[PDB]
Amino acid sequence: IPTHAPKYEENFNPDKKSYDPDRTRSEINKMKAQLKKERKFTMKEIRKDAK
């Protein structure tokens, strides 16, 4: 039977995301998540003080 080696990262953490080996696509994914949460919080707060 053939025998493959298992791919896994060492010192795994689920809460952190996976370490992508590109610093210009992991960075855009990080800052897309950052603008989504800050935009959502910002416009939530301005519509509730408008209320």
């Binding site: 039977i1 053939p2 080696a5 298992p6 896994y8 990262e9």
Partner: protein
């Protein structure tokens, strides 16, 4: 008078999985494995008897039941046994927390312990592990009960110490040409050998001595190899 095969060059055996409920094989089920993960604040670990004084006592449990080393050294024995190389075995494990893991024959389980610990953390939290060559998926958490994945003609026995002792060779040649054999062995440090009462019709044993877990696995595998001429 009987001719040869048309091709004497040796093919690799077909690696079997739960998607083949036809072929006669040997299933080995490592029951009551101690595979739990835990947080440190920053870090995730697999619960040992030795990575902590009282993380297990803070979780409530006792430290003697957090033994992943013995399912590690069973998994090494089963996947270095010749029946696994010949492709007549697959290894299911089920955690004491009720998590069923299917273990491919094609996997290379790492030889030291904490490499296996770091493998088990990512298996328990990502529910799947691919190969380095990334072509197939070779260690995965699947859905309970195990009888949905075991072959449709499969005698399911369990291993103990207090049972009518048999010999593995004549016991395996008792069963017929398409029947597999599912052997529930307990991967505890200690405990009652009743971990699989609801799946099993025959509770047997291998020796008259208190038999270790991987020694019971290797005994049943070597008996199966002699019964199937491997």
């Amino acid at each position: 008078q009987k001719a040869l095969p048309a091709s004497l060059v040796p093919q690799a055996p077909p690696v079997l999985t739960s998607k083949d409920k036809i072929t006669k094989r040997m299933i080995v089920v490592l029951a009551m494995a101690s595979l739990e993960t835990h947080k440190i604040s920053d870090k995730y670990v697999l619960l040992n008897c030795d990575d902590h004084q009282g993380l297990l006592k803070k979780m409530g449990r006792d430290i003697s039941e957090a033994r992943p080393d013995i399912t590690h050294q069973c998994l090494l024995t089963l996947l270095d046994s010749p029946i696994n190389k010949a492709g007549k075995l697959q290894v299911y494990i089920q955690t004491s927390r009720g998590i069923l893991i299917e273990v491919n024959p094609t996997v290379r389980i790492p030889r030291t312990f904490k490499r296996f610990s770091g493998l088990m953390v990512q298996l328990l939290h990502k529910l799947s592990i691919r190969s380095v060559n990334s072509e197939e998926k070779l260690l995965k958490v699947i859905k309970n009960p195990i009888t949905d994945h075991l072959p449709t003609k499969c005698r399911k026995v369990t291993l103990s110490f207090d049972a009518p002792v048999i010999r593995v060779q004549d016991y395996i040649e008792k069963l017929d040409d398409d029947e597999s054999i599912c052997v529930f062995v307990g991967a505890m440090a200690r405990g009652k050998d009743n971990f699989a009462d609801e799946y099993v019709d025959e509770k047997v044993g291998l020796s008259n001595y208190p038999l270790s877990a991987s020694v019971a696995c290797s005994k049943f595998c070597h008996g199966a190899e002699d019964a199937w001429n491997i």
